[PDB]
Specification:
2 copies of one chain form a homodimer. By secondary structure, the first copy, chain A, is mostly helical. Chain A contains 2 helices and no strands. Chain A has helices at residues 3-28, 32-55. In chain A, helix 1 (3-28) runs antiparallel to helix 2. Chain A starts with a helix and ends with a helix. Chains A, B: This is Regulatory protein rop. Chains A, B: It comes from Escherichia coli. Chains A, B: GO terms for molecular function: identical protein binding.
Amino acid sequence: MTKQEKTALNMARFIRSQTLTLLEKLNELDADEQADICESLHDHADELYRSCLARF
Amino acid sequence: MTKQEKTALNMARFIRSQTLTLLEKLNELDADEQADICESLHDHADELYRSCLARF
């Protein structure tokens, strides 16, 4: 991979981790609708990360 | 807002910014399918941030 692709892959992995950290924060606050949105977000983040891994 | 809600709101805003930064990285690499996924991701991130703002 190039250095620019490595950066992009690391960023997608970071976002994917961050959305799981926020999901647990929103579960601690019992913010139901926001946690449902956030779970979908983390799944969408994982889909991007895996797409980057396959391409790069 | 409580301090825990402020943290959660700041995290949602951070993710929303991060997905726009990655979108521009993926456009620079001409990674078409990944940028399309990432655009949708940033829209989904904005939807979570706005949902948090309205609740908190």
